[PDB]
Design an enzyme around this catalytic site. Sequence first.
Site, mmCIF file in Angstrom:
data_model
loop_
_atom_site.group_PDB
_atom_site.id
_atom_site.type_symbol
_atom_site.label_atom_id
_atom_site.label_comp_id
_atom_site.label_asym_id
_atom_site.label_seq_id
_atom_site.Cartn_x
_atom_site.Cartn_y
_atom_site.Cartn_z
ATOM 1 N N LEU C 41 36.336 17.994 46.195
ATOM 2 C CA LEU C 41 37.533 17.896 45.382
ATOM 3 C C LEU C 41 38.554 16.981 46.057
ATOM 4 O O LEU C 41 38.450 16.644 47.240
ATOM 5 C CB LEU C 41 38.146 19.273 45.134
ATOM 6 N N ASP C 42 39.557 16.583 45.288
ATOM 7 C CA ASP C 42 40.453 15.521 45.704
ATOM 8 C C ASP C 42 41.636 16.052 46.502
ATOM 9 O O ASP C 42 41.864 17.258 46.613
ATOM 10 C CB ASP C 42 40.939 14.746 44.488
ATOM 11 N N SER C 43 42.399 15.106 47.053
ATOM 12 C CA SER C 43 43.582 15.420 47.841
ATOM 13 C C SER C 43 44.630 16.135 47.010
ATOM 14 O O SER C 43 45.371 16.977 47.531
ATOM 15 C CB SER C 43 44.176 14.132 48.400
#
Lengths: 176, 459, 87, 68, 128, 56, 102
Positions: C41-43
């Site tokens: 998953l992303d920042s």
Amino acid sequence: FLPSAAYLTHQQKVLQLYKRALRHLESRCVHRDKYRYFACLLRARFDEHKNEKDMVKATQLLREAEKEFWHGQHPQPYIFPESPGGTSYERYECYKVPEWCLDDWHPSEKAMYPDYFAKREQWKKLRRESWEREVKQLQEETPVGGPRTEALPPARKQGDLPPLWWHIVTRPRERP
Amino acid sequence: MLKYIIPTMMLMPLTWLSKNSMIWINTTLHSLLISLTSLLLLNQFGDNSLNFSLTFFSDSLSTPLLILTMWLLPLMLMASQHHLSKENLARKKLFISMLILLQLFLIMTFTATELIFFYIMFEATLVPTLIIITRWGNQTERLNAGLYFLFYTLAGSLPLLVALIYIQNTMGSLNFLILQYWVQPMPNSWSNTFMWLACMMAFMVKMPLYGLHLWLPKAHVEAPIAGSMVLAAILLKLGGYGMMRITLLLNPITDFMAYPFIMLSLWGMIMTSSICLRQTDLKSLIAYSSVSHMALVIVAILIQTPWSYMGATALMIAHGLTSSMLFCLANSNYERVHSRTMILARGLQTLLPLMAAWWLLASLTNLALPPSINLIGELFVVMSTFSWSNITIILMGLNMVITALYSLYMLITTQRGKHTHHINNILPSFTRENALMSLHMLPLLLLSLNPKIILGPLY
Amino acid sequence: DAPPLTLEGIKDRVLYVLKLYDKIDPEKLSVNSHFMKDLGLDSLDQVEIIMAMEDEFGFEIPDIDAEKLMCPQEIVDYIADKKDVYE
Amino acid sequence: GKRLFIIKPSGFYDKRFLKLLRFYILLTGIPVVIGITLINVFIGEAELAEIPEGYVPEHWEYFKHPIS
Amino acid sequence: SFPKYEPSRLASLPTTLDPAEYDISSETRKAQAERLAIRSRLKREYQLQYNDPSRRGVVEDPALIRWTCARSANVYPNFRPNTKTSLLGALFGIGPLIFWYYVFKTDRDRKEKLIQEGKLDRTFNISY
Amino acid sequence: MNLFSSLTLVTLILLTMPIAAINFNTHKFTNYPLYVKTTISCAFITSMIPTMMFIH
Amino acid sequence: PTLRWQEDPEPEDENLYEKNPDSHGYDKDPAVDVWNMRVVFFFGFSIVLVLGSTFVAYLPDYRMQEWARREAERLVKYREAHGLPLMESNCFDPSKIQLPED
């Protein structure tokens, strides 16, 4: 103004903006459901142009974002009652006594608490036993003619303690 | 009175022919004995003063100041060790005998009858202060401090001699009674203006008034604790005592010629309370505080009301005790850290948890907490000056506000919020400093109960 | 006002609120995982996770750290720093 | 297996000083108040009469309180 | 949408809308690198002379000493009497004094003349 | 009334023991909160009486 | 190639404790410091403070106070009991006064 590098970056700058706007949106928005709605709306507004290969239009959109944020902040942003600015701000600092004391006690009370002072004395011998050679050699050993950083290396050499650790370890316990 | 003079002399060869670990008990014990001895004095009653000889006498202005002096010596003599116990035995003996000769000339000065004798004993009060502060001035400008000191005090106090000799050979002798019972009014020729100007200006210098207070701050920031307590309490209230006496003559022109000095004192009182709001060198805040209280004293002297003189003498004694105590506390803190600066040594509600009680108590007396004496003084002076004019209370109340805020800033700056946690050398409180605080703040509260003693001649 | 936190307990509470989060699985949800390598998953949602921890336990963590947690074990370690977790 | 260890500055020197202060005031605070209580419970204050005819007093025989 | 936040001597300009922070030239990178280097070396000297177990006294900062000696003792040298210094000196030192002087003359001459008429309310004014 | 003045002055003076108590005790009483609460309660019950005498 | 000095490195910070944990005020001579404590209390409070408290708590009427109370009592009772107005103005007798003339 930060210990690691000379600047934040673009990425973390946008990130801190997102944290602040989401926090202000908490402080604006009670009832938690419309909060959840508007939070997903805000995330979508950042999702619109996340993938610009451009950079200069991105940072210009960052500045115009800061304008519409600072126009729309809250009078009381919701600061937590542990943070500076907040309600606590070292609230129980009445008892945050540093531990260079407690050795300047009369030996009647050093007889009142014996085992603690025995183990504390071997702590201080642990400190002085590895103070000179390993710590000061590891400090004058590794860096450049100027230090140019605010981190410091660990004591991966063989055994004993990482350098300059005494006032990091021996602190108040933040609720006495 | 020679019953007080001669054991104060014979306390001096005492200190010579004692030895190591033997001077101290003799000096301190016997000086406390002399304090009881002059606690015997207070008999003074009714009709006039009381005459201790064909030569000495005591007004009831002189009794509390004299008792304050003999109270303040043993306190001082205990206070001035641990910063010179590691110096030599001969130099230490010379120090103690210097203070005893100092007290001897102060008793000589307060129990004067003739104003010429008063003048001789005035500058004999001066010369030990010089030698103490220069020999143990303990910082790099004790030179300049002593130099400024002696030239302001002499060159102001020099023509005072000429004016008094002129009065001597125009109106007979100089008993305070024969200064009284024979004084005739003197009109507004310009020679009268200069004569009044000479006498009042010499004591103005010694108060200080506002345009001549930079005499002070070098001479207290670069002094040892003994000479500082001496200088503040005994010498400033000695100058006030002198003007309180010699204002008996020359009342018919003091009205016409007193307008610039009152206004100088008022605007300078406001400016001095402002200038002690922002300085570093914590030792100097007490000095500027002292200039603020002495400006209020000078307002009280140049207005000539019996209300004003009652307020003046109470403000004298209470400020003497407050400033002497607070100098001793600042010396305690400088014995802790080698700084003298304000923003460095911080914390100390945690550590030494009863040193702060004495800081709180002195700070509230300097606030003029109301049962204390300093509020009695300030309040009656404000009453008398409001009967003087319907306008001056702006200045007095604004003095009260700024005095509250700098005194509270002294309290909660250095002793509130966070220790700097790279100190790690301060010792827990000795018995000695606790004893010194105890000797200051028992008599202040004990006079707070029964203050009919310390009010002036116009009781 | 002091119920004692403990290491097993803080581990369970943090993993409870990660497991309640939507777009991860309860299968590949490890203590020694990554918010960069394996959960992928992303920042952005990583800082949504940081927001979840701050809003559960009641205190901010600063942005000098929110750059650089990126795994649940260091989350547990960092509230162990803020709370000084022994009885 | 519950309790912790506070870090105090000291208690020794402080409580020693205050214990000494109450002892050294109290050692002559007590017998003097006992003495004056015996004074105004035995010896009498004074009585409010006038000057006897042809009998000058001392400079005492003038005051209410006997210690004065 | 916003009048772009005029600053003041009181309202600080915040970190965000500078707008000088977004014109990063290489000189600002150079300056931030050297400024971090200065802070690094000073924390190194301070931390080594802060964690010595033998170090009994205080660490004795030359910064505080230098500020104090600049603030008090390094005023009177140096100085020259300029037009600005002399002008502001005679203004803020003599102005209020002479103003308060004239107004107390005025109040006192009023009250002296008025009770010289005798029609003041001093029917019982004993506490003078 | 001697009762009236007596009860008012003791409503004053009941607030004067405990400060002098822990200024003079130095043996730390465990019952110190209970002590200050019970002297405030006793000051209350002494203060209820002369007010009702006043309205009476 | 120069020093300009030759003396000891300064100071020598003596903790007055850590050779005496029982120590009162001044330096490490053990018994005479206890004598300092004992003299500055026992001849500083135990003989000065409470005795001064008695001695100034009362003494005779300092500046004739209660003398003036009772004297004014008797005089005002006399000036009620003989009709004449209390506190006659013109404190000196106008028979024994001489105004200079015009």
